[PDB]
């Protein structure tokens, strides 16, 4: 299957517009190469693959019934998570000098998600009876913030790529 297309892919999208390189019509643990390798639950029919930027703390987020920013306001899962997840570093790739703004994550949103929606809006998150009309400032914000990733970040603050391999069996 097209793994070298999906996995070792020079650009990965900010989570706010998470990729779905679904494959079809077509060991990773052993000889260790990656940080988080969890095959939760454990032939497939419809297999789903995803990749986005996160730091090294909040891999915790992407899981059934798990609570916080990249679960809540970016990418949330159901409670019966059958699949394999491959998370691993990308500090030598995702960390330029004096700022890495090539990445983003959704901060401001009224509600969390249900499982597996994508939502990409830059529409100004309504905060007060004072309107926004797109004119931000106070009572009117910009929904996202960038990760601003950079290299000396310790064990907590460095970008780590993720592979989500969710499966659906009709």
């Amino acid at each position, epitope marked *: 299957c097209p793994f070298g297309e999906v996995f070792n892919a020079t650009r990965f999208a900010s989570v706010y517009a998470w990729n779905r390189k679904r494959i079809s019509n077509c060991v990773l643990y052993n000889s260790a190469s990656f940080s988080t390798f969890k095959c939760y639950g454990v032939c497939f029919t419809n297999v789903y693959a995803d990749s986005f930027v996160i730091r090294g703390d909040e891999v915790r987020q992407i899981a059934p019934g798990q609570t916080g920013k990249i679960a809540d306001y970016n990418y949330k899962l159901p409670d019966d998570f059958t699949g394999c997840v491959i998370a691993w570093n990308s500090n030598n790739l995702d960390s330029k000098v*004096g700022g890495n*703004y090539n990445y983003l994550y959704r901060l401001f949103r009224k509600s969390n998600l249900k499982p597996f929606e994508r939502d990409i809006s830059t529409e100004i998150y309504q905060a007060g009876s*004072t309107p926004c009309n797109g004119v931000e400032g*106070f009572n*009117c914000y*910009f929904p996202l*913030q960038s990760y601003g990733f950079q290299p000396t970040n310790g064990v907590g603050y460095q970008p780590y790529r993720v592979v989500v391999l969710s499966f659906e069996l009709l």
Partner: antibody
């Protein structure tokens, strides 16, 4: 954590000017990018700001339209245009950094903490 | 769009000075977001006090301030001719904008 503005420029009345503010050594997108005017002898008049994450402007009710703020991600640099220049626009225009980290508990803090290097704008008809 | 300082304040060496920042019940009343900036001639502004009372590192503990009701205060203790500047106050507004005060010249006598 350091900012640097472009250098002093002269324009004949009617023209416009490009004026840049350049970040070094801190995350350029987390914090907002404001800009303030100090004419000779007067106080500091807030003008507007720009979200470095892709777009987004708010102006004060005297600079709207003819002031236009934009940014570019590649070299951590933000830009301000003054259209329809007339003589008493001649001033010193600062860019200001202070802005949108959070509204929460872990992270917060406002109030422009990193100003810049006082980029003059002189408007006159006389030649070099 | 109006936050009111006195144009002029005059203090003796060693003594303390008060520089109020009037703002009625919009941003100085219910919004603890008054901020103070200092400016020497030629130099760019410098952050004196942010967040009503707190101070940013490097700024002398001689500076201080509070905000209650409709008056915000910035108090310089043990004055110095070194401190002589323009001290602007600043708040953000329900109007979503950003607004500086009229500005206050400090002269330090003697």
């Amino acid at each position: 954590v350091q900012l640097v503005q472009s250098g002093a420029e002269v324009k004949k009345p009617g023209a416009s000017v490009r004026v840049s503010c350049k970040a070094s050594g801190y995350t350029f997108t987390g914090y907002y990018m404001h800009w303030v005017r100090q004419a000779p002898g007067q106080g500091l008049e807030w003008m507007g700001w720009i979200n470095p994450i892709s777009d987004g402007t708010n102006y004060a009710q005297k600079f709207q339209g003819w002031v236009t703020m934009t940014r570019d991600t590649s070299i951590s640099t933000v830009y301000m245009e003054l259209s329809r220049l007339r003589s008493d626009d001649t001033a010193v225009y600062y860019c200001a950094r202070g802005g949108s980290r959070c509204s929460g508990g872990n992270c917060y803090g406002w109030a422009y903490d990193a100003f810049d290097i006082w980029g003059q704008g002189t408007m006159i008809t006389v030649s070099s | 769009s109006a936050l009111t300082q006195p144009a002029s304040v005059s203090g003796s060496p060693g003594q303390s000075i008060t520089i109020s920042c009037t703002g009625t019940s919009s941003d100085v009343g219910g919004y603890n977001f008054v901020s103070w900036y200092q400016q020497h001639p030629g130099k760019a502004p410098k952050l004196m006090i942010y967040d009503v009372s707190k101070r940013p590192s490097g700024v002398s503990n001689r500076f201080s301030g509070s905000k209650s009701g409709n008056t915000a205060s910035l108090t310089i203790s043990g004055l110095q001719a070194e401190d002589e500047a323009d001290c602007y106050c600043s708040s953000y507004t329900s109007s979503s904008t950003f607004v500086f005060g009229t500005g206050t010249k400090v002269t330090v006598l003697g």
